[PDB]
Amino acid sequence: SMNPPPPETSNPNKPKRQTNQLQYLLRVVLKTLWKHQFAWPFQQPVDAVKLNLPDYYKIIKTPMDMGTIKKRLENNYYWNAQECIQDFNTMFTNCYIYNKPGDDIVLMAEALEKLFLQKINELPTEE
Ligand SMILES: Cc1nnc2c3ccccc3c(-c3ccc(N4CCOCC4)c(NS(=O)(=O)c4ccccc4Cl)c3)nn12
C-alpha cells in the first residue's frame, strides 16, 4: 500500500480542450523529453515499492510524471497549455524536493528541465 493511486488521466467533470499548443506539447515537447537518454525515471509514477523508497510519498504529495502527462494530452484532459506546463514543472520540483543537489537523479532532472525550457520557448502562437 506504499504506492498511492496514480494521478487521474481523465475526469468526468473536468472540461476538455484541444489546441495547437497542446498538440505541440505532445508531439514535440513531450516526445523530445521522452526519448532523451535520461527520461526513464520520469516515464511513469515513482514506484516506491519497487525502488524501496518508503518515504517518497511521505514527502511528495503532488506526484507527477511524463507517463501521466502523456495520457492526459492523449485524452485531451487539459484546458490549455499552461495546465500541462504546470504538470511538467511539478515533476521537476518534486525531484528537487526529494533528492539532494548533485544526486544523479537530480542531474538528470536538471538536464531534462533545461531541454524543456528550450522547447517551450518555441511553443507556437495559439491558432
Ligand atoms: C522521479 C524521481 N525522483 N526521485 C527519484 C528517485 C530517487 C531515488 C531512486 C530512484 C528514483 C527514481 C527512479 C525511478 C525509476 C527508475 N527505474 C525505472 C525503470 O526500471 C528501473 C528503475 C529509476 N532507476 S534507478 O536505476 O533506480 C536510478 C536512476 C537514476 C539515478 C539513480 C538510480 Cl539508482 C529511478 N525516480 N525519482
From Swiss-Prot:
Membrane-spanning parts: none
Site (Acetylated histone binding): 99
Record's disease association: Cornelia de Lange syndrome 6: A form of Cornelia de Lange syndrome, a clinically heterogeneous developmental disorder associated with malformations affecting multiple systems. It is characterized by facial dysmorphisms, abnormal hands and feet, growth delay, cognitive retardation, hirsutism, gastroesophageal dysfunction and cardiac, ophthalmologic and genitourinary anomalies. CDLS6 inheritance is autosomal dominant.
Biological role stated in the UniProt entry: Chromatin reader protein that recognizes and binds acetylated histones and plays a key role in transmission of epigenetic memory across cell divisions and transcription regulation. Remains associated with acetylated chromatin throughout the entire cell cycle and provides epigenetic memory for postmitotic G1 gene transcription by preserving acetylated chromatin status and maintaining high-order chromatin structure. During interphase, plays a key role in regulating the transcription of signal-inducible genes by associating with the P-TEFb complex and recruiting it to promoters.
Gene behind the chain: BRD4
Covalent link (Glycyl lysine isopeptide (Lys-Gly) (interchain with G-Cter in SUMO2)) residue numbers: 58
Domain Bromo span(s) in chain numbering: 17-123
Annotated protein name in UniProt: Bromodomain-containing protein 4
PTM statement from Swiss-Prot or TrEMBL: Phosphorylation by CK2 disrupt the intramolecular binding between the bromo domain 2 and the NPS region and promotes binding between the NPS and the BID regions, leading to activate the protein and promote binding to acetylated histones. In absence of phosphorylation, BRD4 does not localize to p53/TP53 target gene promoters, phosphorylation promoting recruitment to p53/TP53 target promoters.
Locations listed in the record: Nucleus; Chromosome
More about this protein: JQ1, a thieno-triazolo-1,4-diazepine derivative, and I-BET, a benzodiazepine derivative, have been tested on tumors with success. Treatment with GSK1210151A (I-BET151, a I-BET derivative) has strong effets on mixed lineage leukemia and promotes myeloid differentiation and leukemia stem-cell depletion.
Family: Belongs to the BET family.
